[PDB]
C-alpha cells in the first residue's frame, strides 16, 4: 500500500540516501543487520512503505544504488549498513562520469541505464501498489546530474501517473566546488522541469549556514548535512507510515503545492533545530516550531525567501499537538507576512499533523515552501552558464561525447522561461 | 580496479621515478624488496605476483644503460620486473634526431611491446604517467616517438606527462633549446596534461623553504614524487570529493590545446620550523598562490588563472576549504579570467603525506597540491622561443640533426608551432 | 612499518546533529572541580557561604 | 502576574545575583539544573515572578547577567547554580571597564547597552504584567556602576511606570579597595537619585561588622556577605511570592517608605542573625526579632541610625505569628525611641506579615529603613571626592573617554543637594 | 582570550626574559621542549596558558615572545641551551654587531638594520592573537642596545598601536654599583622616549636586589640569575590576575587607572615582600599583616631610594594564594594608621588591592622558599625622584667636560639631544616635586 | 552507552588491549565498531568531566607522535547490540619530574591519560578491574606511574583500593606517589 522506490544517484545522492536509511531505520526500529528491534506496533504496521520483508524478521530497504564509480558502493558495503541493502541492488559501473554530463547521460551511464531500469522494475512490480519514486542526486556533478535525469526520463516514460520526488542538491557560488558545475546544473534542470513532479532544492551553502549559526557547529561534516536532509525527507513522508490527526501523503502535497505544472521546486526546512547549550532552556511549542519553519535563516536554499512572495507552503507537524494551536499559528503567520504571500490564492499555507514524532524528539515540524525566491538561484546558475558559454569555456569536453552546440542553447532557453514563469507571479 | 601505467624515459625521468616509487612503497608499506608484511590501495601502482610479492606497474627505458644498471645494482633492484627495465647501448647524446630516428627506433618496438603487455594485464587502466626531460636528447626524442605511438594505439586513454622544463638561466646542456622546441610540437598532439617543472624553481624552493642551500637532484625529485603521489592519491585512498584523472582533465583543461598546468606543494617547511608553525588550511591555501612557491620559474601574478585544482590531504574539513577559497577569491592579486567564475576544483583525501626517512620534508597533518592552468607559462615558452631564435639565426648545431636523418625545415615548423601556442595563450587570456 | 599503512578517519563520519536532535537526553550534570584549584577556591569562597541559620 | 526582571552588572553585582538566585531557588525548591524538586505546592504557585517556563517542569530565571569582562561569565557558569541561567541572557564585552566610570558609561557601556536592552525587553515582553525591575551592582567599580547607571536611565526611558529597585554596594573609606572609587560613586549617586524608585544602600564595612559582632564568622569571605544581602533581597519581596495575613508588594513598600521623591535611599537589615554559639541560648520570637530589626548594629549601611531621625521604617515579617504581638512591638519601638523618629509623621513603621518563612527558620523579619543616617554615608564619599578633585587626581583617565570636569562638579553638587535635603528633615 | 606580548631587548632584557619564561613554563605546566604533558589541562579553567603561550597545530606551545639583540651571543646561548625547542626560531631576532654601550649605535645605525624585521615579527604575533591586552617590554635602562633599540621600538609601537598597554621593566642604574662608565648618558637619552611612550615603567636597581639577597636570602655573593628570577617573580605576580581566578581581579587597564595619577607620573616601585630563605621559612609566621608590613619597609624596596623622604601616591597590592579580604582590610588599616608611611593629602584612599587564588610557584634550585602567601606592592612614590637627582648629578659631572660625546655624535646624535634629554629629566623631577607638595 | 554491533566477534575477551598498531589494523573502513566505540567513550568522558574539548579520539590516537594503549569494556546484550562500560588510556612520556626538597628528575614514567567509568556502574567494580588488568598487562606497579590531573574520584579510588597517600602535585600538572627512587637526580638541591 503506497510503496515508495528510492534511487540514489551520484556520490552526493548516494551519501544522502545512506544517511536517510540510517534515520529511517532508527525511526522504525530496524537493526543495522536488517532485523526488527522496535518496541511499538506502529513501527511495523506501515513498514512496507520503504522496506521489503525478508521472512526471518529481516527487512531489506527498497533502495536502488547507482553510480558509475564503484568507490561509493564499496564504501556503502563497508559501512555500518552494508548488509542492509540487497547485494544485487548495487548497480555500479567501472569508471566515473568525470564530472561530465555528456558521458553519464549519453555513453557511460547509457550502458548502465538498462540494468538500472531492470532493477527498478524488479523492485516496482514486487510492490502491492506503488506510490512514487524518491531519487537523490546532485545537480553540480556529472554522473548524478546525468544518470538521474536519464533515469527520470525513462521512469516517466514507463510510469506516467506515479508521482516523482527528487531531492536534488543544487550548486551554490559560495560553495563552488567544480569548474563545470553550471553546465551540468542547467542540463539537469531542463530534464527536471520536463519530467519530474516534485523537486526539493537542497543547497550546501544554506546547510553550512544553518549548522554554523543555528546549531552552532564549529566543524560541519557531511554527515551533519546529510542528517539534516534525511530528517527533511523523513518528515515529508511521515503521513505515509504513521497515522495522524490530519494526513497528507505525497499526492496531496503535490496537489496543494503546484498551481501550474512547471512550478514544482520547493525549499524545505526543519523546526526543532536548536543549539547544544540552548536545547534545555528552550520551550518547544507549536509557535516556536512555526516561527522557526518560516524563519528565513532556517531555509535550506541560498536564496532568501523574503525576496519573493510565497506561492504555497506546508508544515508537516509531528507529535501530539492541538490543531487549534496549529490553525492559529498558520493564521498568525499569514497575517504577519501578508506581503510575502500571493494575493490570488486565498489560503496558502497547508498543514498536516502526525502523531508519532521522530525518535528521541518530543515534536517536530518539516516545512516545505514553494516560493518565487528560487528564481534567484536559477538566475545565478544561468549567469554562470552564460559566462562560461560566451567563450565556450569547456564545451569541447561535452561535444566529444556526442552532443551538439545547439543543445546547450536549448538548455539555457528553458532557464529563461523557468525564471520568467516564477517571476510572472511575483509582485 | 583503478590503476595507472607509469613510464620513465631518460636519466631525469628514471631518477624521478626512483623517488616516486620509493614514496609509493613507503605509502603502501611495501618493503623495497617488493614484499608487503602487512588494504587494497596498492592495486593502483603495484601488481600481485600471487606469492605475496608486489611488483610496480612501470616501464623504465633509457638508451644509455648506466642509470638502469645503477638501479639494478641498487637497493630497489628487487621491485621492478627484471626484464621490463629496457636499456639500449648508447645514449642519444643530447640529440633529438639520435633518440627519434636512429637509436630510438631500435628499442621503441620492445618498449611498446612491454607497455602493451602491461596494458593487457591491466583491467582498469586510468591513464599514462610519463616522466622525461625536455632538454635531454633521449628524454625528448624517444618520449616524442613513444607517446606518439601510444596515442595511436590507446587514443581513448588519458596521457599525463611530468616533463622537466629547462630553467630560464640554469642549464646543463648547450643544445637543450633545440630539443625542448622539438618536443613542444609533439606534446600538443598526444599529451593530455603536461605538468612541467623547473630545476631553478625547485632550487629556490629548497633554498627559501627547508633551509637547504646545497640541494642535489635527490631533493628536487622527492618533491616531484610528492606532487605525483598527491595527484594520484584520489584513486587509491578514500576521501570526500575524490578527483579522478578524467575529472582532473575535465575541470582543468578548457580547450583542446590549453592543457599545460603548473604544479605546487605548499606545506614544505623545515622540521625545526614545522613544529612552531600553525599549518592551518587557510595558511597552506594562501601560500599555494605565492609566486615563489610554484615549481616553474614563472610569475603567476603576470598571467591570469583559468582553472585551479586543490588536492588536499590529511586532516581537512570541507568548510575550512570553502572559507579559504572564498578568502582567495576575495583577493584581487590572484586574478581569474572573467569567463570562468568557478575556476576552483577541490579534492580532499583522508591520507596524510608519508615523509621519507632522511628526507628534507617534515611530518605535517595536512597538505595540499595546487595545480593551476594559468597563462604565466607563456613567459617561459617565450624565453625558450627567444633562445631558439638566437641559436637558429646562425644555424649553430643543426648539422648533427641533418646528418642524423632530420630535415632542417622541421626546426622552423616546431618554432612556428610554439609561436602559435603562445598566440593561443595570448588570445585565450583576453577577457570576454 | 605499521604507521606507514593507510590511516582511516572518523572525524568526517561524526554525526553531531543526531545528538542535538535527541532532546530526551537531559542529564545536566558536571563533575566537581578541584577544591584546591583557583576556580574551586573561588566557587567555595565568593560563590559559597556557610550555614548561619 | 507580577513578574520581576533581575539585572546583574559588574563582578559584585554578578556574584550577589548568583547568591540571590541560589537562595531563591532554595526557597522555591528549584534544582540547580533548573528542575523542580520542591515539596510544597505554595512554592510552585506564583513561581512566574522569578522563573519562566521551559517545558517538563524546568524553570529558568528572568535574570540578565551583564559585565564587560567575559571572565565573570565564565566564573558564573562554572560556579554553583551556573546552569540555572540562559546563555542568551549572558551579554558581555571584550574587556572590563577598568574601574573607569567613563569607559563603562560612554563607550564600552554604550556599545554593550544595545544588546543588554534587547535582552531585557525580550524578557520583559514575555511577562504577563511585570511588577518592575530589580538590579544588583556596585558603585565602587567602573563596569558595574557606569553601565548600571546607563541601564537605569535607559530602562526608566523605556518603562517609566515600573518599579526600579537597585541594591547598590556603596564604597566606604574603611574597606576601600579601589583608588578611584570615590569618583565612580559620586558619578553614580546622581543617576541613582534621578531614576531609581528605591535603592537599598549596602556597605562592605557594615556587613563585615555584622559578621564579626552579630555572628561569629571567622575569616568572612565575600560569599557570606553576598548571602546576607541575598537574604535581604529575598525578604523584601516575600509577599509577591507567598500568602500572608498582611501582604505588601514593592509598590506598597515604596508608598509607605518614600515621603518625598528623592528620599528613597533605604537601609536593609536581617533580624534572625544569631551566632552559631548563641543558637539555643535565645528564642526567636517576635519581641527579640523586632529588637534586632531596629538594633543599630544590625544595619547594612554602616551608618549609625542613632545619629539621624528615622523617617519611615518597614519590617516585613515571615512565618506564622500574631498580628497583635507585631503591632505591640512596633508601637513599643516607636514610643521608647521617639527622639529617633520624625515627629511630623504620626506612624513611622509599615507592617507586613507573610506566611512562609525561609527554609530553616521558624520566622524572619527583613527590616528596611529610610533613616537620615545616610547623611554620613554619602558625606564620607563627598569628602573623599572633594579631596581628590582639589588636585584633579586620576582625572585624565576619565577625560580620555570624553568627559569634562563640569560633569564631576555637577555630580558633587547633586550629592551635596541630596545630603542637604536629608539634613533638612534631620532635626 | 586575553593575551600579552613580551619583548626582551638587550642582554639584560633577554636574560630576564629567560627567567620569566622559565617561571611561566613552570606556572602553566609546560616543558622546555614546548609540549604540555597534560592533555586534560587543555580544558576548563586551565586555559590560563593561552595568555602567555600560543598553541600550534602540532600540540606544542610557542611563547608569545620576541627576543631581539644586536649581538648574537646571548641569543645563541638560548639556541644552544635548554630552551632550544621552546622559542620560535624566527622570534629569536639577532643582529651581527653589538651596540657597544652606545645609545646612538643602538638607536639609528644598528637599529635601522633590524627594526623592520622586529616590527614585522611583533605584528605577526599581534595578528595571531585576538585579545591582546598589551606589551611587556624588558630591557636594561643603561645599556647600549637595551636603550637605543628599546627607544626606537617603543616609539614605533606607540605610533603603530596607540592605545595598547606598554609595560616596561627597566634595570635602572644603581647609585654606586656601575658596570658601565657611560651608562648615565644612555639612561637620560632613553628616559625621554620611555616617558612619552610607556604606561608603567617599573624601574629596578641592581644594588637594591643585591642588598635584598644579602639580608633576606643570606646570599653573600649573588649573581644576575637571582636578580632575574626575582624580577620574573614580580612580573608573573603582576600578570597572575590576567589568567588565574580570584576575588578582586586586577586587569592591566584598571591597574594603570588606579596607580597612575597624572600622565607623566607613571614610575612606580616594585617589591616582592615574602622573600625569605627555606631555613627561615619555618620560624616565620608569614601572616598577611607581616607580609603587608614587609612590603613597606625600606629594606624590601628594589629601587635604592628612601621611601620615607617621599609621600606615597597610590599603592597596588597583588596578593596570591590563600588570602582573605578581611585580613587585607586590617593590614591596610594598620598601614594607614602608621605615621611613618606618609601619604599625600589629595589621595584619601590609594590602595588598589588585588587578590588571586594561585599560590606562588618556586623554581627548583631557586633561593626563594615555598610560601602559601605572596604579594607585590607597587607604589607610585615621590621618593623615587632621588634616583633621578643622582642620575642628573652624575650626568652633569660627566658632561661638564663633554667626555665621551664624540662616540655619540659620530653616529648621528647631536648635543642638542643631550640638552633636551637633560631638560626633560629636570622637568620630570620638578613635576614629582610639585605634585608631592600637599595642597 | 550502547553500540549496535557484535563486539564478541571482533574482540577476544571482555577486556581488550588496543595499541596504535591494533587500532590501525582495526580501521574504521571495515571495523567501524571499535572506532565508533572509542569516539563515543571519549566524547562521554569529555562531557562528564566538563573539558572544553575531547581528549580521546581514534583519529587523535592513530596519528599521535608516541604509541598509546587504550582499554575499553564491552558486553554483548542481545545479538547485534553491545554496551560500553569504561575507557582507559595509558602511555609512556618523558616527564620532567620533581619531588620534595626541590629534587630534579628525568626518568620516563607511565601516564594515565584518561580514566572514565560509566555513571551507571561507576563504582560497580569496573574501574578497579580495568586498572588491575592494565597493571597485569603492562607488568608495571603503581609506584612508577603518574596521574594527569587526578579528579577527586581518582585519588579517593587510590585511597580506598591501594592506600596511596601524599600525592605530589608536579609542576607538569601530574600527580605521583611518594616513591621517587625510579632514577637518579640530575640536580640535587645542594
Ligand atoms: N559584598 C561584596 N562586595 C564585593 C564583591 N565582589 C567585589 N566586591 C566589592 O565591590 C567593589 C567594586 O568591585 P567590582 O569588582 O564590582 C568592580 P566592577 O566589577 O563594578 O567593575 P569592573 O571591575 O571594571 O568589571 C569593591 O569594593 C569590591 O571589594 C562581593 O562578592 N561581595
Ligand atoms: N629535476 C631533475 N632534473 C634532472 C634530473 N636528472 C637530470 N635532470 C635534468 O635533465 C636535463 C637534461 O636531460 P637528461 O635527462 O640529463 O638527458 P636525457 O633526457 O636522458 O637525454 P640523453 O642525454 O640522451 O640521455 C637537465 O636539465 C638536467 O638538470 C633529476 O634527477 N631531476
* Dist. CA D418–CA F9, nearest whole Å: 84
Determine the Cα–Cα distance for residues B228 and E220; give it in Å rounded to an integer. Answer: 68
Q: Render the burial of F179-190: b for 16+ CB within 10 Å, e for the rest.
A: ebeeeeeeeeee
Residues of E in contact with F96 (CB under 8 A): 31-32
- Contact state of A281 with D87 under an 8 Å Cβ cutoff: yes
Q: Which of F42, F146, F173, F180 best tests the E interface by mutation, with the highest count of E CBs <10 A? A: F173
- Distance CA(C35)–CA(C46), nearest Å, equals 13
Contact B332, B390 (CB under 8 A): no
Instruction: Please report the residues numbered 1 through 30 in chain C whose beta carbons come closer than 8 angstroms to any beta carbon of chain F.
Output: 2-3, 5-11, 13-14, 29-30
Residue nearest to atom 12 of ligand 2 (CA): B136
B41 in Cβ contact with B93 (< 8 Å):
no
Q: How far apart are CA F79 and CA A31, in angstroms?
A: 10
Query: Cβ distance E346 to E399 under 8 Å?
Result: no
Whether residue D170 contacts residue D214, with contact meaning beta carbons closer than 8 Å, is answered with no
Is D188 a pocket residue for ligand 1 (Cβ < 6 Å)?
Answer: no
CB pairs under 8 A between B and E: 24
Count CA atoms closer than 13 A to D84's CA, side-chain side.
Answer: 28
Is residue E14 classed as helix, strand or coil in its secondary structure?
Answer: helix
- The dihedral of CA D88, D90, D95, D97: what is its sign? positive
Distance CA B340, CA B322 (A): 17
What are the beta bridge partners of residue D266?
D200
CB atoms within 10 A of CB E34: 23
SS3 E234: helix
Is C11 in Cβ contact with B354 (below 8 Å)? no
E10: region left, alpha or beta (phi > 0 left; psi from -120 to 50 alpha): left
CATH of the domain at F136: 3.40.630.30
Would you call F106 exposed, middle or buried from its count of C-beta atoms within 10 A (0-12, 13-18, 19+)?
middle
Q: How far is the CA of E153 from the centre of ligand 2 (A)?
A: 51
- Do residues E421 and E192 lie in contact, with contact meaning Cβ atoms separated by under 8 Å? yes
Residue B387: how many other CB atoms lie within 10 Å: 18
Alpha carbon A200 to its chain's center: 4
Beta bridge partners of B59: B7
Alpha helices in D305-391 (DSSP H): 323-335, 374-389
**Distance from C-alpha of E262 to C-alpha of E265, rounded to nearest angstrom:** 5
Asked if B57 contacts B118 with a C-beta cutoff of 8 angstroms, the reply is: yes
Ligand nearest to the CA of B10: 2
Clarify whether E254 is annotated catalytic.
Answer: yes
Chain C residues with beta carbon closer than 8 angstroms to that of F20: 2-3
Torsion sign, CA atoms E107, E108, E113, E118: positive
User: Which residues lie below 8 Å from residue E206, measured CB to CB, with a gap of 6+?
Assistant: E171, E174, E177, E227
Q: What is the dihedral sign for C-alpha A254, A257, A261, A267?
A: negative
By the 8 A CB rule, do F109 and F57 touch?
no
Cβ distance E376 to E271 under 8 Å? Answer: yes
- Are E46 and F50 in contact (CB < 8 Å)? no
Which residues touch A328 (CB under 8 Å, ≥6 apart)?
Answer: none
Residue D318 neighbours by CB distance under 10 Å: 26
**Dihedral over Cα of A183, A187, A192, A193: its sign:** positive
HSE, side-chain direction, 13 A CA sphere, residue D71: 27
3-state per-residue secondary structure call for chain B? CCEEEEEEEHHHHHHHHHHHHHHHHHHHCCCCCCECCCCCHHHCCEEECCCCEEEECEEEEECCCHHHHHHHCCHHHHCCCCCCEEECCCCCCCCHHHHHHHCCHHHHHHHHHHHHHHHHHCCCEEEEEEEEECCCCHHHHHHHHHHHHHHHHCCCCEEEEEEEECCCCCCCCCCHHHHHHHHHHHHHHHCCEECCEEHHHHHHHHHHCCCCCCCCHHHHHHHHHHHHHHHHHHHCCCCCCCCCHHHHHHHHCCCCCCCCCCCCECCCCCHHHHCCCCCCHHHHHHHHCCHHHCCCCCCCCCCCEEEEEEEEEECCCHHHHHHHHHHHHCCCCCCECCCCCCCEEEEEECCCCCCCCCCCCCCCCEEEEEEEEECCHHHHHHHHHHHHHHHHHCCCCHHHHHHCCCCCHHHHHHHHHHHHHHHHHHHHCCCC
Task: Give one DSSP letter per residue of F50-84, joined into a string.
Answer: T-SS----HHHHHT-SS-EEEEEEEEE-SSS-EEE
Q: Say if strands F174-176 and F168-169 run parallel, antiparallel, or are unpaired.
A: antiparallel
Q: Is residue F188 part of a domain?
A: no
Cell representation of residue E384: 623615587
Where do we find the cell 603503581? F142
What distance lies between CA A88 and its chain's CA centroid?
25
Q: Which of D11, D103, D172, D225 to mutate to test the pocket of ligand 1 (most atoms within 8 A of CB)?
A: D11
CA distance E363 to F96: 13
Nearest to B339 by CA among A412, A182, A392, A396: A392
* E43 touches C at CB < 8 Å: no
Domains and CATH numbers, chain B: 3-239 (3.40.50.1440)
Nearest residue to A231 (alpha-carbon basis) of A323, A163, A293, A303:
A293
Distance of alpha carbon E196 from alpha carbon E424, whole angstroms = 11
Nearest-Å Rg of the Cα atoms of chain C is: 22
Whether C51 and chain A come into contact, CB under 8 Å, resolves to no
- C-alpha torsion F172→F173→F178→F179, nearest 10: -50
**Cell numbers standing for residue B168:** 630560464
Are E435 and E381 in contact by the 8 Å Cβ rule? The answer is no
Residues of chain C with Cβ-Cβ distance to E44 below 8 Å are: 33, 39
Which cell numbers in the block locate residue D339?
A: 527622639
- SS3 state of residue A89: helix
Which residues are within 8 A (CB) of D357 and not within 5 positions of it... i.e. 6 or more apart?
D318, D319, D320, D363, D364
Distance CA F160, CA F152 (A): 12
CA distance A10 to A181: 14
- The alpha-helical segments, DSSP class H, found in A53-131 are 70-78, 101-102, 108-125
Cell 646561548 locates to E77
Check residue E9 and report its DSSP letter: E
Backbone angles phi, psi at D169, to 5 degrees: -100, 90
- Element housing D111 (H / E): helix D108-125
Technique used: cryo-EM
**Within 13 Å of residue D232, how many CA atoms lie on the same side as its CB?**
31
| A:B CB pairs within 8 Å | 94
State the residue range of the domain holding F76. Answer: 2-176
Q: What is the distance between the terminal CA atoms of chain C, rounded to a whole angstrom?
A: 69
Query: To 10 degrees, what angle do helices A222-236 and A204-213 make?
Result: 100
Chains touching chain E, criterion 3+ CB pairs below 8 Å: B, C, D, F
Interchain CB distance below 8 Å, C7 and F62? yes
- How many angstroms separate the Cα of B431 from the Cα of each of B125, B335, B424, B425? 38, 11, 13, 12
Domain membership flag for residue F9: yes
Whether residues F172 and E31 touch (CB distance < 8 A) is answered with yes
Nearest Cα neighbor of D368 from D306, D311, D283, D326 is D311
Collect all residues with Cβ–Cβ distance below 8 Å to A181 and sequence separation of at least 6: A99, A139, A140, A141, A171, B342
Residue F100 domain-assigned (yes or no): yes
Q: What is the DSSP letter of E35?
A: B
D169 Cβ closer than 6 Å to some ligand 1 atom? yes
CB atoms within 10 A of CB A149: 30
Grouping H, G, I as helix, E, B as strand and the rest as coil, residue D106 is helix
Q: Are residues A300 and A267 in contact, defined by beta-carbon separation less than 8 angstroms? A: yes
B34: left (phi over 0), alpha (psi -120 to 50) or beta: left
> For residue A331, what is the enclosing H or E element?
helix A323-336
CB E272 within 8 A of CB E175: no
- What one-character DSSP code corresponds to residue E337? H
Angle formed at CA E55 by CA E54 and CA E60, multiple of 5 degrees: 115
Chain centre distance of CA A308? 22
Rounded Cα–Cα distance for residues A82 and A66 (Å)? 15
Domains within chain A, CATH numbers bracketed: 3-251 (3.40.50.1440), 265-373 (3.30.1330.20), 376-424 (1.10.287.600)
Interface contact F54, partner C, CB < 8 A: no
CA D142, D143, D146, D152 torsion-angle sign = negative
State the chains in contact with D (3 or more Cβ–Cβ pairs under 8 Å): A, C, E
Task: Name the resolution in angstroms.
Answer: 3.3
Do A280 and D58 count as a contact with CB atoms less than 8 A apart? yes
A chain contacts of residue D53, beta-carbon cutoff 8 Å: 283
Q: Quick check: do F and A touch, 3+ CB pairs under 8 A?
A: yes
Please give, rounded to a whole number of angstroms, the shortest distance from the CA of A280 to a CA of chain D: 8
Q: Which protein residue has the closest C-alpha to ligand 1 atom 5?
A: D12
The tally of domains found in chain F comes to 1
- Closest ligand to D75 CA? 1
Could you give the CA distance from residue E9 to residue E139 in angstroms, rounded to a whole number?
5
DSSP conformation class of D163: E
| CB E380 within 8 Å of CB E261 | yes
Q: Which residue lies with its CA nearest to atom 22 of ligand 1?
A: D143
Q: What is the DSSP string of A144-186?
A: HHHHHHHHHHHHHHH-SSSEEEEEEEEP-GGG---TTHHHHHH
Q: What is the DSSP string of A278-322?
A: TTTTS---HHHHHHHHS-STT-SSSS-GGGS-EEEEEEEEESS--
Q: What CA–CA distance (Å, rounded) separates A147 from D208?
A: 81
Name the one residue in this structure whose C-alpha cell is 503546484. Answer: A258
Region of D382 on the Ramachandran plot (φ > 0 left; ψ -120 to 50 alpha; else beta): alpha
D369, D270 contact by CB (below 8 A): no
D204 lines ligand 1 (CB under 6 A): yes
Best residue in F36, F60, F80, F82 to probe A by mutation, most A CBs within 10 Å? F80
Distance of alpha carbon D200 from alpha carbon D268, whole angstroms: 6
* Nearest Cα to Cα of residue B265 among B342, B346, B205: B205
Q: List CB contacts (< 8 A) between D75 and chain C.
A: 39, 42, 46-47
Which atom of ligand 1 lies closest to the CA of D104? 24
Please state the length of chain B: 432
Q: Is E37 part of the contact surface with chain F (CB cutoff 8 Å)?
A: yes
- What radius of gyration, in Å, describes the C-alpha atoms of chain A? 21
Q: What angle do CA F179, F182, F184 make, to 5 degrees?
A: 115
Q: B144: Cβ below 6 Å to ligand 2?
A: no
Collect all residues with Cβ–Cβ distance below 8 Å to F163 and sequence separation of at least 6.
none
The answer to whether E431 contacts chain D (CB < 8 Å) is no
Rg of chain F taking only CA atoms, in angstroms: 18
Based on C-alpha coordinates, what's the Rg of chain E?
21
Amino acid at each position: 500500500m503506497r510503496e515508495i522506490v528510492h534511487i540514489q544517484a551520484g556520490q552526493c545522492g548516494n551519501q544522502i540516501g545512506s544517511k536517510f536509511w540510517e534515520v529511517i531505520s532508527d525511526e522504525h526500529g530496524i537493526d543495522p543487520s536488517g532485523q526488527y528491534v522496535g518496541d511499538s506496533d506502529l513501527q511495523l504496521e506501515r513498514i512496507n512503505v520503504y522496506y521489503n520483508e525478508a521472512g526471518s524478521n529481516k527487512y531489506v530497504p527498497r533502495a536502488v544504488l547507482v553510480d558509475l564509480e564503484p568507490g561509493t558502493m564499496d564504501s556503502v558495503r563497508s559501512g555500518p549498513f552494508g548488509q542492509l541493502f540487497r547485494p544485487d541492488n548495487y548497480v555500479f559501473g567501472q569508471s566515473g562520469a568525470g564530472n561530465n554530463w555528456a558521458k553519464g547521460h549519453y555513453t557511460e551511464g547509457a550502458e548502465l541505464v538498462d540494468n538500472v531500469l531492470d532493477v527498478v522494475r524488479k523492485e516496482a512490480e514486487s510492490t502491492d501498489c506503488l506510490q512514487g519514486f524518491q531519487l537523490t542526486h546532485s545537480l553540480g556533478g556529472g554522473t548524478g546530474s546525468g544518470m538521474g535525469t536519464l533515469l527520470i526520463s525513462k521512469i516517466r516514460e514507463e510510469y506516467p501517473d506515479r508521482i516523482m520526488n527528487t531531492f536534488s542538491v543544487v550548486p551554490s557560488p559560495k560553495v563552488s566546488d567544480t569548474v563545470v558545475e553550471p553546465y551540468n546544473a542547467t542540463l539537469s534542470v531542463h530534464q527536471l522541469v520536463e519530467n519530474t513532479d516534485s523537486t526539493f532544492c537542497i543547497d550546501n551553502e544554506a546547510l553550512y549556514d544553518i549548522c554554523f549559526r543555528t546549531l552552532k557547529l564549529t566543524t560541519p561534516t557531511y554527515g551533519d548535512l546529510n542528517h539534516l536532509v534525511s530528517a527533511t525527507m523523513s518528515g515529508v513522508t511521515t503521513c505515509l507510515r504513521f497515522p495522524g490527526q490530519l494526513n497528507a501523503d505525497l499526492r496531496k502535497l503535490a496537489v496543494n503545492m503546484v498551481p501550474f505544472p512547471r512550478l514544482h521546486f520547493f525549499m524545505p526546512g526543519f523546526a526543532p533545530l536548536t543549539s547544544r547549550s540552548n536545547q534545555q532552556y528552550r520551550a518547544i511549542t507549536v509557535p516556536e516550531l512555526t516561527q522557526q519553519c518560516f524563519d528565513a535563516k532556517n531555509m535550506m536554499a541560498a536564496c532568501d525567501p523574503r525576496h519573493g512572495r510565497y506561492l504555497t507552503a506546508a508544515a508537516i507537524f509531528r507529535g501530539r499537538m492541538s490543531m487549534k494551536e496549529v490553525d492559529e499559528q498558520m493564521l498568525n503567520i499569514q497575517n504577519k507576512n501578508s506581503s510575502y504571500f500571493v494575493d490570488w490564492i486565498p489560503n496558502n499555507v497547508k498543514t498536516a499533523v502526525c502523531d508519532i514524532p521522530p525518535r528521541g524528539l518530543k515534536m517536530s515540524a518539516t516545512f516545505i515552501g514553494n516560493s518565487t525566491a528560487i528564481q534567484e538561484l536559477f538566475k545565478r546558475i544561468s549567469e554562470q552558464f552564460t559566462a562560461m558559454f560566451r567563450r565556450k569555456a569547456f564545451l569541447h569536453w561535452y561535444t566529444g561525447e556526442g552532443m551538439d552546440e545547439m543543445e546547450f542553447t536549448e538548455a539555457e532557453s528553458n532557464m529563461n522561461d523557468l525564471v520568467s514563469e516564477y517571476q510572472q507571479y511575483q509582485e | 580496479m583503478r590503476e595507472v601505467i607509469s613510464i620513465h624515459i631518460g636519466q631525469a625521468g628514471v631518477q624521478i621515478g626512483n623517488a616516486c616509487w620509493e614514496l609509493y612503497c613507503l605509502e603502501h608499506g611495501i618493503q623495497p624488496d617488493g614484499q608487503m608484511p602487512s588494504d587494497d590501495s596498492f592495486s593502483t601502482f603495484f601488481s600481485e605476483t600471487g606469492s605475496g610479492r608486489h611488483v610496480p606497474r612501470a616501464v623504465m627505458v633509457d638508451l644509455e644503460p648506466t642509470v638502469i644498471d645503477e638501479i639494478r645494482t641498487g637497493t630497489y633492484r628487487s621491485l621492478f620486473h627484471p626484464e621490463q627495465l629496457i636499456t639500449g647501448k648508447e645514449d642519444a647524446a643530447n640529440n633529438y634526431a639520435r633518440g627519434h630516428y636512429t637509436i630510438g627506433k631500435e628499442i621503441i618496438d620492445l618498449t611498446l611491446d612491454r607497455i602493451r603487455r602491461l596494458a593487457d594485464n591491466c583491467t582498469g587502466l586510468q591513464g599514462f604517467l610519463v616522466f622525461h626531460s625536455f632538454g635531454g636528447g633521449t628524454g625528448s626524442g624517444f618520449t616524442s616517438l613513444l607517446m606518439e605511438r601510444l596515442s595511436v594505439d590507446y587514443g581513448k586513454k588519458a596521457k599525463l606527462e611530468f616533463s622537466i622544463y629547462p630553467a630560464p638561466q640554469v642549464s646543463t646542456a648547450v643544445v637543450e633549446p633545440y630539443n625542448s622546441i622539438l618536443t613542444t610540437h609533439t606534446t600538443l598532439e598526444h599529451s593530455d596534461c603536461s605538468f612541467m617543472v623547473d630545476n631553478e624553481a625547485i632550487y629556490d624552493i629548497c633554498r627559501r623553504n627547508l633551509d637547504i642551500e646545497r640541494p642535489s637532484y635527490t631533493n628536487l625529485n622527492r618533491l616531484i614524487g610528492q606532487i605525483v603521489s598527491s595527484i594520484t592519491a584520489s584513486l587509491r585512498f578514500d576521501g570526500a570529493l575524490n578527483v579522478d584523472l578524467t575529472e582532473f582533465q575535465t575541470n582543468l583543461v578548457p580547450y583542446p590545446r590549453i592543457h599545460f598546468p603548473l604544479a605546487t606543494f605548499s606545506p614544505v617547511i623545515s622540521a625545526e620550523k614545522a613544529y612552531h608553525e600553525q599549518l592551518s588550511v587557510a595558511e597552506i591555501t594562501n601560500m599555494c598562490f605565492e609566486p615563489h612557491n610554484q615549481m616553474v620559474k614563472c610569475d603567476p601574478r603576470h598571467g591570469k588563472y583559468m582553472a585551479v585544482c586543490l588536492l588536499f590531504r590529511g586532516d581537512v574539513v570541507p568548510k575550512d576549504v570553502n572559507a579559504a577559497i572564498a578568502t582567495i577569491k576575495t583577493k584581487r592579486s590572484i586574478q581569474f579570467v572573467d569567463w570562468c567564475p568557478t575556476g576552483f576544483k577541490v579534492g580532499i583525501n583522508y591520507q596524510p603525506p608519508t615523509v621519507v626517512p632522511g628526507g628534507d620534508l617534515a611530518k605535517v597533518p595536512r597538505a595540499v597540491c595546487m595545480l593551476s592552468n594559468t597563462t604565466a607559462i607563456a613567459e617561459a615558452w617565450a624565453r625558450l622561443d627567444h633562445k631558439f631564435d638566437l641559436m637558429y639565426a646562425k644555424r649553430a648545431f643543426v648539422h648533427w640533426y641533418v646528418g642524423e636523418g632530420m630535415e632542417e625545415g622541421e626546426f622552423s615548423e616546431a618554432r612556428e608551432d610554439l609561436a602559435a601556442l603562445e598566440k593561443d595563450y595570448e588570445e585565450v587570456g583576453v577577457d570576454s | 612499518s605499521r604507521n606507514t599503512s593507510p590511516i582511516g578517519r572518523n572525524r568526517p563520519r561524526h554525526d553531531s546533529v543526531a545528538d542535538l536532535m535527541r532532546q530526551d537526553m537531559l542529564a545536566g550534570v558536571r563533575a566537581e572541580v578541584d577544591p584546591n584549584s583557583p576556580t574551586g577556591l573561588k566557587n567555595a569562597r565568593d560563590f559559597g557561604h556557610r550555614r548561619i541559620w
